[PDB]
Amino acid sequence: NNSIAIPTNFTISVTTEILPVSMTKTSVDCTMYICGDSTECSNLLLQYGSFCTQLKRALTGIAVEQDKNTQEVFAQVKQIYKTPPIKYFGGFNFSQIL
Amino acid sequence: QSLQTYVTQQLIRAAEIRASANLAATKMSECVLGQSKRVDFCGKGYHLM
Amino acid sequence: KGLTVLPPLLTDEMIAQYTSALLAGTITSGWTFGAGPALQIPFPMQMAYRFNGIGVTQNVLYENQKLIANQFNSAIGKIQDSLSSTPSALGKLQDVV
Amino acid sequence: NNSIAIPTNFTISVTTEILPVSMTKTSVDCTMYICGDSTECSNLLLQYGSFCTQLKRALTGIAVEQDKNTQEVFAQVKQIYKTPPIKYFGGFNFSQILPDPSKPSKRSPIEDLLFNKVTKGLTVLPPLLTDEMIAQYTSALLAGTITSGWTFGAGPALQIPFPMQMAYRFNGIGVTQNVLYENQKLIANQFNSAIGKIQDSLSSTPSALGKLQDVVNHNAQALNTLVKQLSSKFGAISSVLNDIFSRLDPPEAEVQIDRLITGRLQSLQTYVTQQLIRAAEIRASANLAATKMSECVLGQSKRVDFCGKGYHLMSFPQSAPHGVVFLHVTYVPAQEKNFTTAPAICHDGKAHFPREGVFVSNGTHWFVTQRNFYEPQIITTDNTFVSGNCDVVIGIVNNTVYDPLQPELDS
Amino acid sequence: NHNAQALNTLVKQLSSKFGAISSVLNDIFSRLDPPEAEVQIDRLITGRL
Amino acid sequence: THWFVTQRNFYEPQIITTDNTFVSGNCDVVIGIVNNTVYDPLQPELDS
Amino acid sequence: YQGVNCTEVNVFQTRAGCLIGAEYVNNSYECDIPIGAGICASYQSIIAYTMSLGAENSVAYS
Ligand SMILES: *[C@@H]1O[C@H](CO)[C@@H](O)[C@H](O)[C@H]1NC(C)=O
Ligand SMILES: *[C@@H]1O[C@H](CO)[C@@H](O)[C@H](O)[C@H]1NC(C)=O
């Protein structure tokens, strides 16, 4: 009840956190994937439906989203700031990050 | 069917990536652009920069 | 096979320029750039403000500045070795690929 | 090393954030879509059985989720607070945000503008909370924020004068109360101007409400695709079930009908799966909206960029179709000037550090000022704390620290 | 509950013919020659997948 | 043997003074209260 | 009945559709079963009522 622990020294710790922001953007040619180069099956594919358009739309949406994700994470600066030519900052070395 | 499966899996993966990107954007504003008082949001210990 | 990879709109070099802008602002302007136009501040004073935020008085930073700077430099040096030494750290990105 | 920029002026900025909260609730009748009015098809469908039930369950779960999402974002008030009839609030005009009695809807002018801007066995189910009810919840939140500040979120509403509440928010951002009181008329004028600009900005740009429109468009596109898929043969002789029955012998006809049934079931499954993924995205947005409502509308947020760009002062919620618009009032530093700065002042062989400020030099004199706004003050024992000696500190500058006690002692 | 319901649904789905003569594969093999059986089995396999 | 006031996250012992302490109530209500001198800055100047 | 006028098919007309077997009550209570369009049903018999968002309160500003 009457005892406390107070730190008498400090440690500066730099830790690395890695977060994925974007994924590969891909597009598929429905006809080439299913029919290859055969014309007859292509006609049959036409009969099956409009699924290929739906698939293309979904993939295109993913691609646009990936570009938006990168913009959100990185394009938070109105102007591209440039570091001062003399890199002296109170004994702190930012060479690795800079 | 194979193509449909690929698209569905990609949509789910995209949702996971979007969540990670949103977290990254949140961290960039909260940690890079300011000091964060939230515990463990920007590293173990008391966040400085 | 009809499967194609579409190039990202932002090139890696452009992303690096955005990152460089963020670093330059943080080192020179502290947190001001996030909340408005960039405001110049000495980096030691910025660190002192950050110390005040965590509840430690600014005097500690100024009095122990050399020690704090050395510790920061050592930590940054350790990070490069740590990332190279362990593949798991970069595993999340690799997993996506 | 020795230069600091301290803002000498401020700008009150209102920014609008549009977040989708709900999506259209849809129900599908499996028999109607797959088989139409054909009894023979219905008998064949019974063999598949559970697939239809599973699809219905998934859609029902999405619909209940949407009602929950709206409740979470808006039903954060247990009582419907009513704004007092007198509308004077320290020179701040809330007419655009507050409800208009003349309108039958009773929606606010900004809400009305937002409302105007947004534009086979498949049915759309009405949302449980009507737009008028959502507006009433929004009005309660606005009344609480304007009259009781942040108290209503954390407990029973506690009345506070609005200028005083604004002063507390200034203290939250690190600016002293005096700045608000001394410049109250200017701050009020800036706030009023910003609100008027908000109405014009939303009206001028169609893309401003684009996120909400995108949700509506995607749901419409999905339904249209589902209806179109009915025409597709799926490798059967004909899309029409009756034509297959009429032109083919019963065993072969059954095989062709089975091909149509399976294709239509696949089409419904694709729609349901896509809707589930979209629902997850909407739920994430709804959770974000609820968090914003609590952190920004019901409190002052110290998080950076969570509630607008700049130092957040207050946020106001406005209902929009299938979404919430947050008006974020922020403090933006302006008119920065450059002053020489020193970490510590050395007086009487002791190191003096600013208690809650930064030492700044006009050129011949040294003053202590708050970081956010430039208010130079004479260095005194009251505003500084003495730790250590001059030697340890780097960049320390020699100057006199006045003592209030000494003149009285001399007298 | 959701996990239990999903598993129960799969077990229930096994009953569905999917346009085949019978849900039971052994019955199809016993009653039909390999060419006809292949078509019926294919329908069952596709539905179960 | 001596009582000091310090910042929570780092050990910087300081003499207890009126400046660093605020006075509320009387001794009886508090549980665990201890008796130590609180220095007043004005008193030495007044004595001089 | 969803989307059907009452005449077309204890009768109340709601935006969702016609409701039969529940008697509309002017008094408002917290929602028990959500019919939709602001109309909720509870067992008191079965009654349909417009849901009450909250008890009205007037804040005081001076
Ligand atoms: C900062 O740099 C200037 C030269 O630009 C130098 O004269 C001064 O001593 C430096 N200050 C510190 C604290 O190192
Ligand atoms: C602290 O705990 C001890 C027993 O460990 C007890 O004797 C003493 O009275 C307690 N002091 C207070 C202030 O509760």
Author numbering:
A (entry chain C): 709 to 806
B (entry chain C): 1002 to 1050
C (entry chain C): 856 to 952
D (entry chain B): 709 to 827, 856 to 1147
E (entry chain A): 953 to 1001
F (entry chain C): 1100 to 1147
G (entry chain A): 612 to 620, 641 to 675, 691 to 708
What do the paper's sentences say?
The Omicron variant and its sublineages have spike glycoproteins that are highly diverged from the pandemic founder and first-generation vaccine strain, resulting in significant evasion from monoclonal antibody therapeutics and vaccines. Here, we describe several potently neutralizing IGHV3-53-using antibodies targeting the RBM, capable of Omicron cross-neutralization, extending to BA.2 and even BA.4/BA.5 sublineages. Structural analysis via cryoelectron microscopy of a representative broadly neutralizing antibody, CAB-A17, in complex with the Omicron BA.1 spike highlights the structural underpinnings of this broad neutralization.
Based on the structural comparisons, the neutralization capacity gain during affinity maturation for the most important SHMs of CAB-A17 can be understood structurally within the framework of reduced entropy cost for binding through the prearrangement of an Ab paratope.
